[PDB]
């Protein structure tokens, strides 16, 4: 039908992928051993999108797991749903990457690239019609960033037509896990700007905030943090997987949201989100979903859009609903918020409806939008990158791998241009 190949890179990529395929299996109704034990024939219409069928009534997911060290590989194998993945899909090295982006790109990325590319091509030509690639990675530096951007370029070389939609977890700009983040993030953005089509930014701090504010979790656990991202992922592709009153695929989203080739970074959000106790008293309707979606506390990127302005906004819905109600609500929010939208783009809000909602919820929605609030995130990492480049600390590790500091200047020049492009386009 219209297939997508899924790639998972490094530690963060694999844990999210494990949660994602758990969610997808629940959606289609696939037993962890591979047998189909679903409840609706509608699950079987587009099961070919994410699955290959093996003889004997067993289904193999279109997932390729990539790492440079086997520690995360062993964790996935011991996992509940590790049996589903094809044994030969597992490609791993024998070296802790060290999160040196120069090391992860030149020293160890090149040797693993040849094996990974052929493994990818195995599933790429095994589908009736490939349409786009799905990549999950973190901007750390070792394998998710360095090897991830290397694979993105090689896939761009191989498949110019197909959509290279990647999901990115930016380092959290108050507390994050390594000192070399600004170097790795600046280079990763440099490569992602030109070669990627859709970049989704997610912040861990906003994920903590949402769990406290809306889910009332006493401690946000990494299982649930990955669950929300997985839910957003499934909602994005739900239009292809099930019918609806007004369809919208990945290409429709890219064409609508992206006015200019460079400005294509997206913030994501989900609704309805409710505590485990208060869901009984909620009267869930279209206005309730609209209020949650445009709420500044449910946007899982820690950059308040109210400081900036919006350019494009998109809305997805899952469930049997009246199209007039959606059309009225999107018009309602657009006129009310007129101070947060550009004057030269009328009808800034896109809408879409899917027939089948996710399991457990009678109604659901997913918000994806583009705004000028991204200027803050780039400015923060630029200031950190500026300090460390001024002192020229930590650069000796990258130099030993063959990366010359003039590459850093090029990356900041591109980042400064991106910051400037957002600033003048705000006017």
């Amino acid at each position: 039908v219209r297939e997508i190949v899924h790639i998972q890179a490094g530690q963060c990529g694999n844990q999210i992928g494990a949660k994602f395929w758990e969610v997808i299996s629940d959606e289609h109704g696939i037993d962890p051993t591979g047998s189909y034990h679903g409840d609706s024939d509608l699950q079987l219409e587009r099961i070919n999108v994410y699955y290959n069928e093996a003889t004997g009534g067993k289904y193999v997911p279109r997932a390729i797991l990539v790492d440079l060290e086997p520690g995360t590989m062993d964790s996935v194998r011991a996992g509940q749903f590790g049996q589903l993945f094809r044994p030969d899909n597992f490609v791993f090295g024998q070296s802790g990457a060290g999160n040196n982006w120069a090391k992860g790109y030149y020293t160890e990325g090149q040797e693993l690239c040849e094996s990974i590319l052929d493994v990818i091509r195995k599933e790429a030509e095994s589908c009736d019609c490939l349409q786009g690639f799905q990549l999950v990675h973190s901007l750390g530096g070792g394998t998710g960033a360095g090897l991830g951007t290397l694979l993105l370029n090689k896939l761009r070389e191989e498949y110019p037509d197909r959509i290279l939609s990647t999901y990115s977890i930016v380092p959290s700009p108050k507390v994050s896990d390594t000192v070399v983040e600004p170097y790795n993030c600046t280079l990763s953005v440099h490569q992602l700007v030109e070669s990627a089509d859709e970049v989704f930014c997610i912040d861990n701090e906003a994920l903590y905030d949402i769990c406290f504010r809306t889910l009332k979790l006493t401690t946000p656990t990494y299982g649930d943090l990955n669950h929300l991202v997985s839910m957003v992922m499934s909602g994005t592709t739900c239009a292809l997987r099930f019918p609806g009153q007004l369809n919208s695929d990945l290409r429709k989203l890219a064409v609508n949201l992206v006015p200019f080739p460079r400005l294509h970074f997206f913030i994501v959000g989900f609704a309805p989100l409710t505590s485990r106790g208060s869901q009984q008293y909620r009267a869930l309707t279209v206005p309730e979903l609209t209020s949650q979606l445009f709420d500044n506390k449910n946007m899982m990127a820690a950059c308040d859009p109210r400081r900036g302005v919006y350019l494009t906004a998109s809305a997805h819905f899952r469930g049997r609903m009246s199209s007039k109600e959606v059309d009225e609500q999107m018009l309602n929010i657009q006129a009310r918020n007129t101070s947060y939208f550009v004057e030269w783009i009328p009808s800034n809000v896109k809408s879409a409806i899917c027939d089948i909602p996710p399991r457990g919820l009678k109604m659901a929605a997913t918000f994806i939008g583009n705004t000028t609030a991204f200027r803050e995130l780039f400015t923060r990492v630029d200031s950190q990158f500026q300090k460390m480049y001024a002192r020229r600390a930590f650069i000796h590790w990258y130099v030993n791998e063959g990366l010359e500091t003039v590459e850093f200047d090029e990356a900041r020049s591109n980042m400064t241009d991106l910051i400037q492009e957002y600033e003048m386009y705000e006017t």
Binding site: K174, V179, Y222, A390, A393, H396
Partner: protein, 430 residues
């Protein structure tokens, strides 16, 4: 699958290793005979049938310390080829241990270490233990690093040495050994940690509830720090940190590797009954000036490196709140050059308690590894102590008569002076 190798030089290194391999066997459930009553491949190898072997070699120039292991209960676990004993020690003389006697056995030790690495497929790293005051520890350590640096090239060489105490001392020629050793490790060592016995005694007395500790208790504390560092390589966790991660994060340059360590909680097995010791509780205890095992003033020492390895019980949200709370303190001043300044490791494995031990049965614990400019305080003390003796040429004749040239003393003195100048330059703002 992924492997580590350890060498122990001197009686300080061997006795530390004795406690460490006690700790691993109880953690991994292996009897002293090597038979079970996993992550074994990281530290142990399966010799067929039902016996295991450790990836360690014990080397010293005197037979007394090695013979004790040969006579001990753990004599069965170790392989006889791994136990290398010399004939006559360096007598606290760096020149004697580096040239005259060290060169006699150096080729023998280098053969065994390389031979053991042949079975070591997924290897990154070595663990070498030194006694800075002792001649053999400093002297043989220099030569061993010199050979290992060129034989293996780009491999993680990490060391766990005991720094001389500011006032507590047992050897008069200690400053001579330390400066010459510092001149060698400053080029041949990727990253080496140091602790001093004076602060170990103080911590073993105030926070811990031992009125009078021996070397066995101090070794157990050192073993716990080593166990926390290697926990990520052996067990899964929400945030696993590899050896290469430590090298990249802790150092901003080439010659500023030297970190300091801290472990919390260090409450005794008796007093610990009263405290739950939450994430915020243990995080605050680490940064106390009293909890350091290096007697350095944190006021003079700005921070530009930190590493939070949590063992036991943690949820990642609590770390983020704890780290953010710590950053708000005005007394703990990070350098301008390090906004982020943090690596954190969340690992599911709780710590281990040894029968007849001293530590508490804590549900959760955290180990600290950080680099601060306060270490430059210790260098000045060593520099001044060396200058006082060399001003009147206190002990020149011993080192000269053992094959060492006289001109090497000003060379190492200038090398240390460059290190102190570099620390002052880096600590300065810009």
């Amino acid at each position: 699958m992924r492997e580590v190798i350890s060498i122990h030089v001197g009686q300080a290194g061997v006795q530390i290793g004795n406690g460490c391999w006690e700790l691993y066997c109880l953690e991994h459930g292996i009897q002293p005979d090597g038979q079970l009553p996993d992550a074994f491949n990281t530290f142990f190898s399966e010799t067929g049938a039902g016996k295991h072997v450790p990836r360690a070699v014990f080397v010293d120039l005197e037979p007394t310390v090695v013979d004790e292991v040969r006579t001990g209960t753990y004599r069965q676990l170790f392989h006889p080829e791994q136990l290398i004993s010399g004939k006559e020690d360096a007598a606290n003389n760096y020149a004697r241990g580096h040239y005259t006697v060290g060169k006699e056995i150096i080729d023998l030790t280098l053969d065994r270490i390389r031979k053991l690495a042949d079975q070591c497929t997924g290897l990154q790293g070595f663990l070498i233990f030194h006694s800075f005051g002792g001649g053999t520890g400093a002297g043989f350590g220099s030569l061993l690093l010199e050979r290992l640096s060129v034989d293996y090239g780009k491999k993680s060489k990490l060391e766990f040495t005991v720094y001389p105490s500011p006032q507590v001392s047992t050897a008069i020629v200690e400053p001579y050994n330390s400066i010459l050793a510092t001149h060698s490790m400053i080029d041949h060592s990727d990253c080496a940690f140091m602790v001093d016995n004076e602060a170990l005694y103080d911590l073993c007395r105030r926070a811990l509830d031992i009125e009078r500790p021996t070397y066995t208790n101090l070794n157990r504390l050192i073993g716990q720090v080593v166990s926390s560092l290697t926990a990520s390589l052996r067990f899964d966790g929400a945030l696993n940190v590899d050896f290469t991660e430590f090298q990249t994060n802790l150092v901003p340059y080439a010659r500023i590797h030297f970190p300091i360590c801290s472990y919390a909680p260090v409450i005794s097995a008796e007093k610990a009954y009263h405290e739950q010791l939450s994430v915020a509780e243990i995080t605050n205890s680490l940064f106390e000036p009293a909890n350091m095992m290096v007697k350095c003033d944190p006021r003079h020492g700005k921070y530009m490196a930190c590493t939070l390895l949590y063992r036991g019980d943690v949820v990642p949200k609590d770390v983020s709140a704890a780290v953010a709370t710590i950053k708000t303190k005005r007394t703990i001043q990070f350098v301008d050059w390090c906004p982020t300044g943090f690596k954190m490791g969340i690992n599911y494995q709780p710590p281990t308690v040894v029968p007849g031990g001293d530590l508490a049965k804590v549900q959760r614990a955290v180990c600290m590894l950080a680099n601060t400019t306060a270490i430059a305080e210790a260098w000045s003390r060593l520099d001044h102590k060396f200058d006082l003796m060399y001003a009147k040429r206190a002990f020149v004749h011993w080192y000269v008569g053992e094959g060492m040239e006289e001109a090497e003393f000003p060379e190492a003195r200038e090398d240390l002076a460059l290190l102190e100048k570099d620390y002052d330059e880096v600590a300065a703002e810009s």
